[PDB]
């Protein structure tokens, strides 16, 4: 010199990243799923479906996970490590 | 009702006219014990050709790849009534496909009552309970001292409906489930099924210890047939009646037709000298006047007991059974392999559902009966 | 009190009296008050299912709370 709005979790955002779901060494891995966090423990999950019409459609979940989520990160093979002020938990998408 | 004054309320209770001219409806829609937000603005007249339909972002998630379907439905639909009938029918479809998001248990009935009924059993029994508590697995002992498991799968209401009962043993397991019946009821039924086979398991464990079992390999409790080997390159397959196991089983012989003849002939002489006081083995040894070898497995670890056409054991359930009537070849084969060999060649000559031909390895007369 | 083990979880360390030996950290007791107990299978089988049942019922509770707030609004 435009900005697009996608989903809107109602609660604040903490973490954005990506995962390699369906993991069937190289550093740049071509990520299949997309991940975002809410705080009050809304998790957003996205994937490519291409199902029932033979056309790409975005498969959304919205999970409601326990605990006020403080921080998270991604590990090898569709795994996310996140934390509640109780416990450090893990999630397998794979 | 006929009119959507009353039929609208009667079908969508949760649709409240904000504006005076009934033009903005808002509030909710019901759907599989699940109410959702809705904000459905009409134009200055009642037209759905132009209408704004905004949602919860939760609702956008569940109307994934029907955005166009419902856009069609808005322009082709007569009334708002009919639109809502369709939007409900449609949600029900979307969610019943996405049916992997649902099912909360009733905690005041379930978790406790399940802890209660497992206390009724005793804690030494339980071997597995799933983290959804949906599956559990339980243990019982025979009078012999054999472990018999039972898998259960549980519904949202365990005590109301039957839990799905899965168990190895061969006769079909029957569990008289009432809403009053419990884990202890079905456990007693399980012990009843164990003891009706108690003699049966002993006869089978006896055969499995003392004889070269061939063709169940680590047999389950479900197997009633036992392909025993005897000498080498002849076998006997044995189906036993589980209610009369010590009693005479239907038994017959595989191998070379010159070796099977005296064995069948001596079984026919000595089948009246069967006695159900002895074991199955202690009657077969005196009927057929033989011993059984103890696992010619470990010495004959590669004798190539493979088809010698395709060179595999286990082609599609079939075993190497068809052999040569020759001392110098003795080469086993399969039904499929030997048939696709003897039909392909010129020399081969078929009577009705038999092929006579030459053994591939030694070129001697070999007979195949389909 | 600290995590001496390198598990993640804190434990409590207790030193019993100097009459036993004229030496530090003889006659100790390390404990977490749960599983971990260091010093000088139907019980411990069926807890995670029950705990996850608690957490799922907690998420349902939390869900209905939010739903009701919306309804009121
Ligand atoms: Zn073959
Ligand atoms: Zn031959």
Swiss-Prot record, chain A:
Subcellular location: Nucleus
Species for this entry: Homo sapiens (Human)
Organism superkingdom: Eukaryota
Name of the protein this chain belongs to: Fanconi anemia core complex-associated protein 100
Subunit composition and interactions: Belongs to the multisubunit FA complex composed of FANCA, FANCB, FANCC, FANCE, FANCF, FANCG, FANCL/PHF9, FANCM, FAAP24 and FAAP100. Forms a subcomplex with FANCB and FANCL.
Function of the molecule: Plays a role in Fanconi anemia-associated DNA damage response network. Regulates FANCD2 monoubiquitination and the stability of the FA core complex. Induces chromosomal instability as well as hypersensitivity to DNA cross-linking agents, when repressed.
Portion of the full-length sequence here: 260 to 372 of 881
Curated annotation (Swiss-Prot), chain B:
Zinc finger (RING-type): 307-363
Transmembrane annotation, as ranges: none
Enzyme Commission numbers on file: 2.3.2.27
Outcome, altering residue 341 to A: Loss of interaction with UBE2T
Keywords, comma-separated and alphabetical: Acetylation, Cytoplasm, DNA damage, DNA repair, Fanconi anemia, Metal-binding, Nucleus, Transferase, Ubl conjugation, Ubl conjugation pathway, Zinc, Zinc-finger
InterPro entries named among the record's database cross-references: Fancl, FANCL_C, FANCL_d2, FANCL_d3, FANCL_d3_sf, FancL_WD-rpt_cont_dom, UBQ-conjugating_enzyme/RWD, Znf_RING/FYVE/PHD
Enzyme class: transferase
GO BP field: DNA damage response; DNA repair; gamete generation; interstrand cross-link repair; protein monoubiquitination; regulation of cell population proliferation
Post-translational modification: The RING-type zinc finger domain is monoubiquitinated in the presence of UBE2T and UBE2W.
Catalytic activity: S-ubiquitinyl-[E2 ubiquitin-conjugating enzyme]-L-cysteine + [acceptor protein]-L-lysine = [E2 ubiquitin-conjugating enzyme]-L-cysteine + N(6)-ubiquitinyl-[acceptor protein]-L-lysine
SUPFAM superfamilies named among the record's database cross-references: RING/U-box
Consequence recorded when altering residue 166 to A: Does not affect interaction with FANCI and FANCD2
CDD domains the record matches: DRWD-C_FANCL (cd23832), DRWD-N_FANCL (cd23831), ELF_FANCL (cd23786), RING-CH-C4HC3_FANCL (cd16490)
Binding site for Zn(2+) 2: 324, 329, 359, 362
A GO molecular-function annotation: ubiquitin-protein transferase activity
One GO CC term on file: Fanconi anaemia nuclear complex
Protein localization: Cytoplasm; Nucleus
Mutation effect (residue 265 to A): Impairs interaction with FANCI and FANCD2
UniProt cross-references to PANTHER family, sorted A to Z: E3 UBIQUITIN-PROTEIN LIGASE FANCL, UBIQUITIN LIGASE PROTEIN PHF9 FANCONI ANEMIA GROUP L PROTEIN
Function: Ubiquitin ligase protein that mediates monoubiquitination of FANCD2 in the presence of UBE2T, a key step in the DNA damage pathway. Also mediates monoubiquitination of FANCI. May stimulate the ubiquitin release from UBE2W. May be required for proper primordial germ cell proliferation in the embryonic stage, whereas it is probably not needed for spermatogonial proliferation after birth.
Record remark: domains: The UBC-RWD region (URD) region mediates interaction with FANCI and FANCD2.
UniProt protein name: E3 ubiquitin-protein ligase FANCL
Gene that this polypeptide is encoded by: FANCL
UniProtKB/Swiss-Prot annotation, chain C:
Subcellular location: Nucleus
Subunit structure: Belongs to the multisubunit FA complex composed of FANCA, FANCB, FANCC, FANCE, FANCF, FANCG, FANCL/PHF9 and FANCM. The complex is not found in FA patients.
Protein task: DNA repair protein required for FANCD2 ubiquitination.
Pathological association: Fanconi anemia complementation group B: A disorder affecting all bone marrow elements and resulting in anemia, leukopenia and thrombopenia. It is associated with cardiac, renal and limb malformations, dermal pigmentary changes, and a predisposition to the development of malignancies. At the cellular level it is associated with hypersensitivity to DNA-damaging agents, chromosomal instability (increased chromosome breakage) and defective DNA repair. Some severe FANCB cases manifest features of VACTERL syndrome with hydrocephalus.
Designated name of the protein: Fanconi anemia group B protein
Gene field: FANCB
Residues of the full protein shown: 330 to 417 of 859
